[PDB]
Design a protein around this nucleic acid. Structure first.
Length: 116
RNA sequence: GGGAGACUUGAGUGCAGAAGAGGAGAGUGGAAUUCCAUGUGUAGCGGUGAAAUGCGUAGAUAUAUGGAGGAACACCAGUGGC
């Protein structure tokens, strides 16, 4: 109901961007996405859509009560920086930024190349 | 070419060292994917050139914490080595 510090997970893929603001323990507080905001098709990956998604999620989080957030960026999407700037503009203080893109140590076999 | 000898440079042994993803056997480590359980949380997620199929209110994706299991071994790594 009332929080001050939290985490913001930005999942940005080539097709969509999802912003998930949680508490420092990971429990979800608010979230939004390009698709959730009405963007469809290619638009979902545009940085502007990421900007709006971060804006809407931040507004809900601040409404719930939240001042500081630390950012974790995941995925190769092109809207990560747009979301971060949107967070700052909407008001939440960006305490820190880290990248948590998983990096398999070889691990599993990725799917086939396209057009083969 | 044959026979009877001699010789040490080829060949090999000895002695002294060197490096190595060489091979076989038995274990073991972390990353990561998927699945499972339980939290938080609400409407999409996923995907394309564009769409649709598909998954999601039986609460998905995301997110936190665990647990299961299979396979391959990021960085080192290098017309490097064996």
């Amino acid at each position: 109901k009332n929080i001050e510090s939290g985490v913001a997970h930005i999942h940005s893929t080539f097709n969509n961007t999802i912003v998930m603001i949680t508490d420092t323990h990971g429990n979800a507080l608010a979230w939004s996405s390009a698709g959730s905001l009405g963007f469809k098709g290619s638009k979902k990956s545009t940085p502007f859509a990421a900007q709006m998604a971060a804006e809407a999620a931040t507004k809900v989080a601040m409404e719930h009560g939240l001042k500081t957030v630390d950012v974790t960026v995941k995925g190769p999407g092109s809207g990560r920086e747009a979301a971060i700037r949107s967070l700052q503009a909407t008001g939440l203080e960006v305490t820190a930024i880290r990248d948590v893109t998983p990096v398999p140590h070889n691990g599993c076999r990725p799917p086939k190349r396209r057009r083969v």
